[PDB]
Design a protein around this nucleic acid. Sequence first.
RNA 1: CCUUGUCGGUUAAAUGCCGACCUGCAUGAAUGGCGUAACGAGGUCCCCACUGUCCCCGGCUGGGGCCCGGCGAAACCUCUGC
RNA 2: GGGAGUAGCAGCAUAGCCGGGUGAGAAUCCCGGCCGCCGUAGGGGCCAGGGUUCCACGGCAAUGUUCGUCAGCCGUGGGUUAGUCGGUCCUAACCCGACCCGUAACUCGGCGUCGGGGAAAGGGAAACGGGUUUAUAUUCCCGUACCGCGGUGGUAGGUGCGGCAACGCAAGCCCGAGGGGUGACGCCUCGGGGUAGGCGGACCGGUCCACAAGGCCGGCUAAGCGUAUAAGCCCGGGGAGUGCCGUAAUGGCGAGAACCGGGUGAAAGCGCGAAUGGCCUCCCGUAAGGGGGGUUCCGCCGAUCCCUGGGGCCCGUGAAAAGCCCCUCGGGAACGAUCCACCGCGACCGUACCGAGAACCGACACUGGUGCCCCUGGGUGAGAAGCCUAAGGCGUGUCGGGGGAAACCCAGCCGAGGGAACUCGGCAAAUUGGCCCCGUAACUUCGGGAGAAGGGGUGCCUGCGGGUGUGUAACCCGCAGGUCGCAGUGACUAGGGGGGCCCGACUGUUUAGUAAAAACACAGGUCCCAGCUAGCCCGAAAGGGUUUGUACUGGGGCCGACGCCUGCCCAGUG
RNA 3: GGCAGGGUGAAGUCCCUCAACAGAGGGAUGGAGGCCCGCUAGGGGUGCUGACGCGCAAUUCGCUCCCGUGACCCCGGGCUAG
Lengths: 84, 146, 50, 89, 237, 62
Amino acid sequence: GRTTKVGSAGRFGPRYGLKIRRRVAAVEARMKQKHVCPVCGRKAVRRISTGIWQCQKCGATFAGGAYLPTTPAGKVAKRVTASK
Amino acid sequence: MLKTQRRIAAELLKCGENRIWIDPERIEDVAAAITREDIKRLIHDGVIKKKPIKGQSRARARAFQEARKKGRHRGPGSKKGKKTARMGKKEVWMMTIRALRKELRKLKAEGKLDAHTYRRLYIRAKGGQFKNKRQLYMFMQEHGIL
Amino acid sequence: ARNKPFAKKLRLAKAAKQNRRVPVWVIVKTNRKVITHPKRRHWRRTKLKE
Amino acid sequence: MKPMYRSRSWRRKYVRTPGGRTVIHFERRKPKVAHCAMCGRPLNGVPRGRPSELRKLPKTKKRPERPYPNLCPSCMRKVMKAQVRASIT
Amino acid sequence: GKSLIQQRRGKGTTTFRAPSHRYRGAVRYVPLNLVQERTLRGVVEEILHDPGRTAPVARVKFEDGTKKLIIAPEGVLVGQEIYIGPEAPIAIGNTLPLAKIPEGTYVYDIEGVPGDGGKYVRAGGTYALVVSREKDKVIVQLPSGELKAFNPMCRATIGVVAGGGRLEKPIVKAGKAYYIAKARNRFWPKPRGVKMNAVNHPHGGKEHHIGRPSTVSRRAPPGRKVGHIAARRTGRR
Amino acid sequence: GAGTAPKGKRNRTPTHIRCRRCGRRAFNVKKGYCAACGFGRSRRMRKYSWSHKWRKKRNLSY
RNA sequence: CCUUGUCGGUUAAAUGCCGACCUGCAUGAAUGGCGUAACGAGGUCCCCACUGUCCCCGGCUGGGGCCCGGCGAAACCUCUGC
RNA sequence: GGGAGUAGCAGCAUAGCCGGGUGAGAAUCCCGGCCGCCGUAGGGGCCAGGGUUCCACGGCAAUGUUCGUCAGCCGUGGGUUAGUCGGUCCUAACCCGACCCGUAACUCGGCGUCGGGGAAAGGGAAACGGGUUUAUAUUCCCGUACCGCGGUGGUAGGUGCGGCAACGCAAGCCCGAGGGGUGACGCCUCGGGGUAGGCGGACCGGUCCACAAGGCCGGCUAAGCGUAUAAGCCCGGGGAGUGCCGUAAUGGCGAGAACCGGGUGAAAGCGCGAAUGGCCUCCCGUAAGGGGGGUUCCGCCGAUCCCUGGGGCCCGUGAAAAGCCCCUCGGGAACGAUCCACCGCGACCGUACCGAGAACCGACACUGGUGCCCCUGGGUGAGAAGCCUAAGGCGUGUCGGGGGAAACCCAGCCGAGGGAACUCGGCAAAUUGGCCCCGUAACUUCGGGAGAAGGGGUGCCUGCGGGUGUGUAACCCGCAGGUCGCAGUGACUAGGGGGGCCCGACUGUUUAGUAAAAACACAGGUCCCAGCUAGCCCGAAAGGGUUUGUACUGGGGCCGACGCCUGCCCAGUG
RNA sequence: GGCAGGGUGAAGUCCCUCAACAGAGGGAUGGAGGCCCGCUAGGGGUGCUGACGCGCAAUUCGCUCCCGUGACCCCGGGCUAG
Ligand SMILES: [Zn+2]
Ligand SMILES: [Zn+2]
Ligand SMILES: [Zn+2]
């Protein structure tokens, strides 16, 4: 909001160093944005627990990644087994 | 030894042991009393009494509150806490915004506001523009809402 | 209120009764020989084995 | 205060007495409301209480008369409709 | 001398034992002697966090009524139907024998010998790839890179394990590591052997240095295997 | 330190209570056996040749 | 090690502190090397203020020490004692 | 025996005086008054532990750091009353036995299963108020209640209805089998409604004051039974986007908003319980006892107590089972309750007292420890701070008396002129200090540094104004004028600051009893073994730990946040 | 089972004015942290090299100093044995 460079890692203040603060901030920013649902198409999906994602509108609950709903290997497996 | 008498009298009179009074001219009659019945008789006859509670007055504090209401005792050398600790941060905002919203509904019910203008004013208030109803009304007047 | 077991209670009762001085007629009958015995116990000095 | 009442499962309450004592009374806590088996939404027409409280009620004051009283009405209607449509052939 | 931590762990004490009463039960498939040639159908009714697993688990209800836990694949939905058996389609979440799984498919939870319930490729974000089929063996590429042969009647499930990317984010604080270790009763915090006394470690002594090569033979006795055990090489590259 | 003050922590549950078989206060209440006679562990009595206590009880030489 | 090395700054006066020089008795790269904001009942040098720290010691307050009544031990002890 | 009629009976809570009494005997025991100490504990309640220390009468050889007529001491007799309180049920981590395996053997080591145990603060049927005893009471008595089992007699029902619906109803009995719910759960933060407690005014009845007004005391109502709204969820109608509705905040809507109506649903309040019951008070010979009175209204603050809903964080996900309510099936009988009224029965153990500067542990009537484990009125004030004070408790943190109290010591106050000349070293002491306004350097991982530094102001009285609010209710925020003092955060409370260098990144830990650190740990970096009947490990074996685990994993070493970097050598040892 | 009171103000959510190729500027909400002050309670033990040192005490007392929502403090039931 009112910070130039730090984001969610402004809770740290001075401590723990550049690399670590930057990485935490980036991971958390990409995680806390509302994602597209695979059942209804609306942007209403949030993380419940590590690996578990839920839509607020339709109530759809699915398993995914730790900090994002999808993974690269997951997309590849989907593509391949859609072929066969 | 009058400990027995004193303890029984306290339990009967629903008080403390140090608030019981025994007549110094009748200690021998009181020593002759070994039953709750006899202690009750002495209490009925006035040889053992309950002393009244003194009580702590509050008249000086009354006078202070009077003067503080009419404007004394509230200057800079009389304060010890931060202004935030004395007023509040969130409570002020709440009472402000609740007042504004109540007033806006009352107007829209009286008929003076249409829904579109009501909505835009609700949003301005939520955003923090006024800080009181006099400012709200000054804005409505400056504009053409009255 | 203080929650004792019954058997512990009975043992404490025996320890309580045990604790008194020699009777006077025993001293007389014995001609001042038996005048004290080995189990005078006071609750602040010597503790029992619960 | 006894240790059994230093335990925060007893919901203490202060009460003034006809003799002017102002004593503390202790009670156990109330269980929460019944929830639907499918959706986990709360149910209607089902009273809250401990077992002794529920045993001082008749049968028809404990649940609604309609069928499947363990389900919310939407889910109940789903079930009845599916039964119907499977009872066609 | 005195004992090492690795020797005290073998005794089986509370300081070292896993707290598995805290966990959800073990994860196994269904026995062959009850899924011989039936191709059972089930519905997913819950997805759960498991404290001893590193992967999320799913609760499947089968037709008879039996409920069971499975390791969840990336993408599986509550209310979805899965199939276990030989005539099950090739779809993320279904369990088939290796002889019925094409080449190029991504696979997890592979048995070592048929009927053993699942042994291989279980962690969050892992996957195996089917390489070759024959009539006597199926060759698979495991996440360590290694090629391994299985019996073609061994069962595996199709897809990727859920819970990947876990290590993309720093732990940051000592307290977070405290909680992460306490969850599975791992030895934490860890001491250094060079700052122990000589009675305690083969390293060890007041000048805080290893005074002999840290590479140790595969045939050394217990109490002496510390450092680099039977190392083929050491260093940067 | 290690002396007078830690002696105050002696109002917990006792290690040993009275024993049902032999009458001594030697029954370990967390483990469930007696440190003198073996009750709770042994159908037979605990008796060692290096010990003097049973000989004293029977007024025996060592 | 010679060592209070030499030059400069800080003082009326510097076996100290800081900065430079390099014959490094016997520095040096994960037995890590060089830096580093924030942090420290860590070690160390200086400036402002302050003071009985000192020049130079003085007067007051309570409790002991001293006399009176009562309870009443110990360490130590060859004999003695310019 | 000498030391010696000596030290100690001070320091952290310096407490007694006057009058009367008892008694052989009174600084030290009793009554009254004055003066004092504690007062988010030295007060109230109660575990473990102790075990009669509890009560009354009688005593003073010993104990009590003095005395003692006193006592937790001595003697003589007494005292603990339960269908509803706790234990007797359930499981947790864990333990044991049998079978089985091993051991030369065992009272030793294991073991899946079967069974049995395992919580006096976890889960878990049912009682409240008042009186009575020298000493027990939710246990005795009085009043008014509830639970379980078993009967008797009637009824609802079997064989009945109202609502579009959400739903509302007395809405059949016995035995068995499934299913659902509840039990049943973490940390942080916020709103709404209530209560205990407190405060202000009026009235009554009393009391303290030359008067005087004014101050102070009392002004009460349990379980149980009956009675309904709030949030939230829901049902009907209705039919929306250059948008409309709402919150402290996040939010909501053709996957059906606004708006009309409704249903279910807490803590509470109200009525009955219930009155010469409890409290206050007013007259008479005072033993029994006697007699008559009052028991009323508004308003404010309110929790750390109770209920109810929202939001946020986890590479971390925060018990289980008994028991209890509901539904559907299967098998039986023709009857018959989860409704009303009545009647009987309800075994065993604990229950006294302390709960700590004297009832526990420390050899003691020990400034330690166990337990600060649960709770606490008024004023100033941000405050459970410190200071004063009510209630309650104490004058026993158990020796006193003299003294214009010699030196000297312990703990404190002031000090002219100088201002670190003292000393290894500014050790110790001093200085600053609360709130409001102004203003704020280098350097920086851009978050900080920072309350940087530095400067002004602050009392009382008289009047004006603002915010929320229905309010001359209550809380909070500004202005002007007059006036006193050496001094207005006037006591209490309450930072001294700045600039260089070395080490360690930081919060954290350490040698109980001479070392708190530059030593340890830490996030992070990098190397090694291992595809599971593995790798590493315990053991005499049987068996076992990592493992309810499977390379984003498990084990083994070294460096130690972050930034810039990490050169050459495989002859030697491995 | 527990931790008075106060401060600072991270993400998230926005409002207004002037403009819109780009942007510029002013106001709020919200309540994170191994954050800050704090003899709240509790926990610890830096210095005086203070009192005591046949002690109140076989490791205590006082003044001063440190932590105080956390890798925190404490309790009942269990486990590891030379
Ligand atoms: Zn969706
Ligand atoms: Zn439902
Ligand atoms: Zn025995």
